[PDB]
Amino acid sequence: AASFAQFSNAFIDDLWQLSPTWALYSGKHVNDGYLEIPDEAGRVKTLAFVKAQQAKLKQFELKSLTSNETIDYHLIDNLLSSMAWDITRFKSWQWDPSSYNVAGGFAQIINENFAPLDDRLRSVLARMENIPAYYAAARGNISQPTLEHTELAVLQNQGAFSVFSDDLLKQVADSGLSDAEKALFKTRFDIASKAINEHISWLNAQVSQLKKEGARSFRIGEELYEQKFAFDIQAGMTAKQLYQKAMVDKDRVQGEMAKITDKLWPKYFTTPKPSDNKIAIRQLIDKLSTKHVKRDDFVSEVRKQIPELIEFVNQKNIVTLDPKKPLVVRETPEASISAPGPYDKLGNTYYNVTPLDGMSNESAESYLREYNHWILQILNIHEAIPGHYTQLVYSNESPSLVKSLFGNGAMVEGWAVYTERMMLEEGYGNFEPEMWLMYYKWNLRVICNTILDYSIHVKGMTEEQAIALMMDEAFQQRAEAEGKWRRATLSQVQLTSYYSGYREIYDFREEYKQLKGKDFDLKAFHEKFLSYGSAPVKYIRQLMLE
Numbered sequence: 108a109a110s111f112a113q114f115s116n117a118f119i120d121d122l123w124q125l126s127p128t129w130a131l132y133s134g135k136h137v138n139d140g141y142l143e144i145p146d147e148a149g150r151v152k153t154l155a156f157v158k159a160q161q162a163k164l165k166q167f168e169l170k171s172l173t174s175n176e177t178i179d180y181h182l183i184d185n186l187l188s189s190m191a192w193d194i195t196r197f198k199s200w201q202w203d204p205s206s207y208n209v210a211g212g213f214a215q216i217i218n219e220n221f222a223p224l225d226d227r228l229r230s231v232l233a234r235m236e237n238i239p240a241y242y243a244a245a246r247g248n249i250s251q252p253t254l255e256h257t258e259l260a261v262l263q264n265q266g267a268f269s270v271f272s273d274d275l276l277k278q279v280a281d282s283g284l285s286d287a288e289k290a291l292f293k294t295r296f297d298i299a300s301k302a303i304n305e306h307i308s309w310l311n312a313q314v315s316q317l318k319k320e321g322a323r324s325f326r327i328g329e330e331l332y333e334q335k336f337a338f339d340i341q342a343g344m345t346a347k348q349l350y351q352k353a354m355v356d357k358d359r360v361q362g363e364m365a366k367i368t369d370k371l372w373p374k375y376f377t378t379p380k381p382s383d384n385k386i387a388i389r390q391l392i393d394k395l396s397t398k399h400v401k402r403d404d405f406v407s408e409v410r411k412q413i414p415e416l417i418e419f420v421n422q423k424n425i426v427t428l429d430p431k432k433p434l435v436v437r438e439t440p441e442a443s444i445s446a447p448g449p450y451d452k453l454g455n456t457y458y459n460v461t462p463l464d465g466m467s468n469e470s471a472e473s474y475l476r477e478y479n480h481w482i483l484q485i486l487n488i489h490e491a492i493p494g495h496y497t498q499l500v501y502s503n504e505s506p507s508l509v510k511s512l513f514g515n516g517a518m519v520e521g522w523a524v525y526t527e528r529m530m531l532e533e534g535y536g537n538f539e540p541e542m543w544l545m546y547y548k549w550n551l552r553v554i555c556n557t558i559l560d561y562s563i564h565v566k567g568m569t570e571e572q573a574i575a576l577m578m579d580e581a582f583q584q585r586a587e588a589e590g591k592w593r594r595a596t597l598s599q600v601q602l603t604s605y606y607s608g609y610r611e612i613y614d615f616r617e618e619y620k621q622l623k624g625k626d627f628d629l630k631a632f633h634e635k636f637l638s639y640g641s642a643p644v645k646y647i648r649q650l651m652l653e
């Protein structure tokens with residue numbers, strides 16, 4: 108009889124046999140030469156896999172599992188339910204033509220310049236076989252598409268030619284493949300190129316028809332939104348509940364900002380203070396944003412700050428940090444943490460911080476105003492200490508393949524957002540009003556991301572309303588607002604992840620303070636919270652309370 112550990116490993120093996128492209132994206136090259144044709148037999152086969160793996164899952168008593176195993180159990184169960192639901196209910200395979208594009212799988216094979224070239228090219232040689240079939244399947248599946256995803260499909264499939272390029276042909280011509288393999292490659296490449304171009308023509312004809320005749324709305328509606336929110340975020344509340352909390356937080360945050368602005372106004376202006384609080388807040392913020400690190404010192408300011416945050420976390424006993432896992436700041440190759448995937452045992456972990464070269468003087472200045480004297484410190488909390496990097500180190504204490512592959516984005520992001528608030532509450536920057544004001548504008552991004560995503564998909568918010576939210580309520584620039592609208596038209600639920608995890612973590616903390624009273628230790632709370640890795644916050648709560 109298989110143990111749960113044996114089952115977990117067999118499950119991943121079976122998942123990769125069903126979808127070797129998913130394996131490829133996860134960093135395991137089980138069959139790079141096999142292009143899955145996304146037709147009805149594909150869906151039937153996915154649903155037969157869901158059914159068989161679910162029945163294997165149900166053989167394990169939940170009382171028979173350790174804490175890590177129970178996390179894996181739930182992550183697997185939820186992944187399975189959401190696969191089935193994607194096929195039978197959400198049906199993005201019908202209305203999102205952008206989900207049909209071969210370029211991605213090919214780029215992952217080709218762009219590993221360390222992997223043997225002849226092996227890569229032979230994988231590509233085989234993977235090209237079924238490109239015509241792949242796009243024939245696409246056209247037979249697509250039905251009542253949205254205008255927006257069809258437009259995205261055109262643009263992304265046009266990008267396929269930066270992979271299916273003259274440069275790929277040259278690599279093939281000068282490789283160690285046999286002359287017969289080279290000629291086959293050319294034959295298949297011409298057939299592939301023709302098929303991609305004919306599909307793009309078809310997509311163009313569709314966009315044109317959708318513009319004339321009307322198209323399915325991009326707004327997924329309440330029923331689908333709640334189901335997607337449950338599968339993706341795995342919050343301990345509904346989306347409607349989170350939205351209602353986001354509306355209240357927006358008001359609380361703006362009220363605090365108005366108070367700070369009243370106190371700081373005479374310190375920075377001699378002109379009168381506008382009676383509309385929101386114009387006043389916007390003007391004070393624009394003025395404070397001119398204090399920023401000099402452009403050429405951006406990367407150095409970051410290196411200087413990280414040890415300052417380390418010192419502060421140690422001094423205040425916020426969480427144990429290990430001095431011999433020193434974080435290496437590096438100037439980004441072609442600000443975020445990059446870390447090896449579960450199948451990459453070699454790779455190192457860095458803090459990628461992009462120097463401001465390439466950009467115009469004017470873009471650089473706009474960037475430095477966004478990442479100003481205060482916001483740069485908050486960014487380094489979020490990204491490095493005690494945010495993402497710290498949480499990643501803690502998750503390396505008790506890892507599992509399942510958590511590494513299918514872990515919860517809401518928890519990972521929610522933690523990083525939580526740390527910003529917790530650090531300031533614990534005295535970071537010594538309760539400086541400027542710092543709090545800037546933090547609050549930053550917090551509004553996260554709150555308003557939730558309002559926006561929900562209101563668009565559930566409440567029919569218009570483009571003009573979405574732009575006025577982001578600019579007038581969250582004090583963002585035009586370009587940022589427009590980018591956010593576009594992202595919300597093309598994706599659903601992901602935008603709520605930041606606030607959802609933050610709210611659950613902070614509320615769980617306050618609940619735990621209540622339960623332990625005088626015996627509440629902040630540091631012990633943090634370390635125990637981080638010990639489960641990237642599990643959904645509600646499961647961490649349940650394990651910590653049980």
Ligand SMILES: [Ca+2]
Pocket residue numbers: 144146148
């Ligand atoms: Ca077939």
Ligand SMILES: [Ca+2]
Pocket residue numbers: 570
């Ligand atoms: Ca528009």
Ligand SMILES: [Ca+2]
Pocket residue numbers: 575578579
């Ligand atoms: Ca406005």
Ligand SMILES: [Zn+2]
Pocket residue numbers: 117120121
């Ligand atoms: Zn098997």
Ligand SMILES: [Zn+2]
Pocket residue numbers: 134135136219
């Ligand atoms: Zn690889």
Ligand SMILES: [Zn+2]
Pocket residue numbers: 147
């Ligand atoms: Zn049929």
Ligand SMILES: [Zn+2]
Pocket residue numbers: 181
């Ligand atoms: Zn359960």
Ligand SMILES: [Zn+2]
Pocket residue numbers: 354358
């Ligand atoms: Zn309100």
Ligand SMILES: [Zn+2]
Pocket residue numbers: 397399472475
């Ligand atoms: Zn400046």
Ligand SMILES: [Zn+2]
Pocket residue numbers: none
């Ligand atoms: Zn400094």
Ligand SMILES: [Zn+2]
Pocket residue numbers: 398399400479480
């Ligand atoms: Zn500074």
Ligand SMILES: [Zn+2]
Pocket residue numbers: 480
């Ligand atoms: Zn300062």
Ligand SMILES: [Zn+2]
Pocket residue numbers: 489495519520523
């Ligand atoms: Zn983050």
Ligand SMILES: [Zn+2]
Pocket residue numbers: 177650653
């Ligand atoms: Zn339990």
